[PDB]
Nucleic acid binder design. Structure first.
Length: 397
RNA sequence: AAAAGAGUGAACGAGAGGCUCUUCCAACUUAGGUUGAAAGAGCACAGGCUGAGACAUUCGUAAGGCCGAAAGACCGGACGCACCCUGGGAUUUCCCCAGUCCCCGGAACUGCAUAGCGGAUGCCAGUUGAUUAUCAGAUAAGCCAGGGGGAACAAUCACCUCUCUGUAUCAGAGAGAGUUUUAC
DNA sequence: CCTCGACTTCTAGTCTCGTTCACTCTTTT
DNA sequence: TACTAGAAGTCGAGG
């Protein structure tokens, strides 16, 4: 039934075994040492022959659901994994990063320089200047001082430059392949190619993935077509599911596969957690709330950009000066994240002794986290949980 | 080859708002306090690096075409610059990267000319300590900062069978040679 | 019948406009 | 979007 992955005494991956009673005997007798809780990996502690058969790794690429499966020369299944990529979050984070950077440079540098210039008298006499910059046909308005030099004419990128999102997706594919290599002795690699007319990040990265996979597996790299996968499915009767695709892909490179049958059993699930979080501010509240008694009646002095609720100006329009004189203002202070916190993806044990993978930290009182939420959605009192293992980028669930 | 279609990276510039303080005018309330209007000044992740580099006025910025009496304008693109290129560095770390920026040079490539750079003038800092000299300190209108991966770090016993308990499902605890080799 | 620890439930987080530039892939014709 | 900080709420313990 189950499959136990085996590693040689030298750290070399070996053929997985399914005897599962020899495994327990070996573990009790001390000849085998557990390497990974899930997928269950054991390393032999004694030298032995390392005969291996060829294995084929089939990849169904995607932006948020990568699928891979390892098969023997006859179409038997020994590994099936489905990875939920963190890719969608990267462009939004990068956009927010750009906005924060522009805010920094506008408010801490440009506005301060303009303020100093007005103070010192070293400003334009007109106070405003229209500047026609090379490469532009319409001027920019510079108030009280020259602009910092604008650089857009001749910025060059190395050939085959990839955006952080596409690079992240490519690196994710390669990293998950490396993790599979740590477990099994992969011999051949098959990739399913995708072309999108749109009349996408994955479409951008497919050729680079093919190149670098070919480098990783010299002479042992094949490519298949989506139509080929569909025909294989129809011919061999594999049930139509998303995670089965990879298996079918892996079965294309087999010359004569007599034991083709759909894998039975849920595949391993892999979650991607960010390695770094450089942000220091949680909430910069920035909303001057006006309460009359205990009811919110206004949100700013004058309505801000993209604000729909009434501000103080409307309230002054509607009510009287004796009403305004009684208002109370409440502006909460900015909140900062703990940057040394236990990041999501960490592995901890609860007070009752159950092991879990951290998903989020919920609540905070007196400078200490209230609840740790596991990847299964169970809340544990953080004071009693014990920290075992730091975040690895790709984590089995 | 171009045409479009889908994405997602970079520089610079304007605001609506926000925080602190001052002046002044109202309103409400135990000269004081709270709220607001108007005018003004300062301030913009937590932080890392650095000691000067920001701004204003003005002068200079190739040869050769070409229009002008001339002054000068236009084209062009170097002996001028650079976002380009070789090398080094800050952000920078447990190991790396992206992005931005800086320094000395400039073979080819790429780009700029109302830009950028250099000079002159003006304006905006900080000066203390240990042994006039050296190290350290202070010194912003300086640069970067909300992006990504990997390593290492388990109280890491999985599956199946039996027993107990809770529990509708099922889960927790204990025990176990379950074909022989993890690969024939 | 209060008060105070120890948890438990629940909510909320900044936006816009300009001047330009760049890279990767796909498809047609 | 969603992880994370923090305000308000609930419940016993105890005197």
């Amino acid at each position: 039934m189950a499959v136990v992955y085996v590693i040689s005494k030298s750290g070399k991956p070996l053929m997985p075994t399914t005897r599962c009673g020899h495994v327990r005997i070996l573990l009790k007798e001390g000849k085998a040492r557990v390497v990974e809780r899930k997928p269950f990996t054991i390393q032999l502690t004694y030298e032995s022959a390392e005969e291996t058969q060829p294995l084929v790794l089939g990849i169904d690429p995607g932006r948020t659901n990568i699928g891979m499966s390892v098969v023997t020369e006859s179409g038997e299944s020994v590994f099936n994994a489905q990875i939920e990529t963190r890719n969608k979050d990267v462009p939004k984070l990068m956009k927010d990063r750009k906005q924060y950077r522009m805010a920094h440079r506008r408010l801490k540098r440009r506005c301060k320089r303009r303020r100093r210039a007005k103070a010192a008298g070293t400003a334009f006499e007109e106070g405003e200047k229209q500047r026609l910059l090379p490469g532009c046909f319409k001027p920019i308005t510079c108030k009280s001082i020259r602009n910092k030099e604008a650089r857009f004419n001749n910025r060059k990128r190395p050939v085959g430059w990839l955006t952080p999102t596409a690079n992240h997706l490519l690196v994710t594919h390669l990293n998950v392949v490396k993790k599979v290599q740590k477990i099994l002795p992969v011999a051949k690699v098959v990739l399913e190619l995708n072309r999108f007319s749109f009349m996408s990040v994955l479409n951008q990265i497919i050729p680079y993935l093919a190149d670098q996979l070919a480098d990783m597996f010299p002479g042992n790299f094949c490519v298949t077509s989506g139509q080929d996968t569909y025909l294989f499915r129809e011919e061999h009767g594999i049930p139509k599911d998303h995670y089965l695709d990879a298996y079918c892909i892996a079965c294309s490179a087999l010359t004569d596969a007599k034991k083709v049958s759909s894998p039975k059993g849920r595949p391993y699930m892999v979650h991607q957690f960010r390695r770094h979080d450089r942000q220091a501010c949680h909430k910069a509240n920035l909303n001057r709330s006006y309460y009359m008694g205990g009811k919110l009646v206004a949100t700013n002095r004058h309505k801000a950009m993209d604000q729909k609720t009434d501000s103080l100006e409307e309230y002054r329009a509607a009510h009287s000066a004796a009403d305004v004189s009684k208002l109370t203002v409440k502006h909460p202070s900015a909140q900062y994240k703990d940057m040394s916190r236990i990041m999501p993806g960490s592995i901890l044990v609860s007070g009752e002794g159950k092991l879990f993978t951290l998903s989020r930290s919920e609540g905070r009182n007196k400078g200490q986290v209230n609840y740790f939420v596991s990847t299964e959605g169970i809340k544990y009192w953080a004071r009693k949980c014990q920290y075992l293992r730091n975040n690895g980028g790709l984590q089995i669930y």
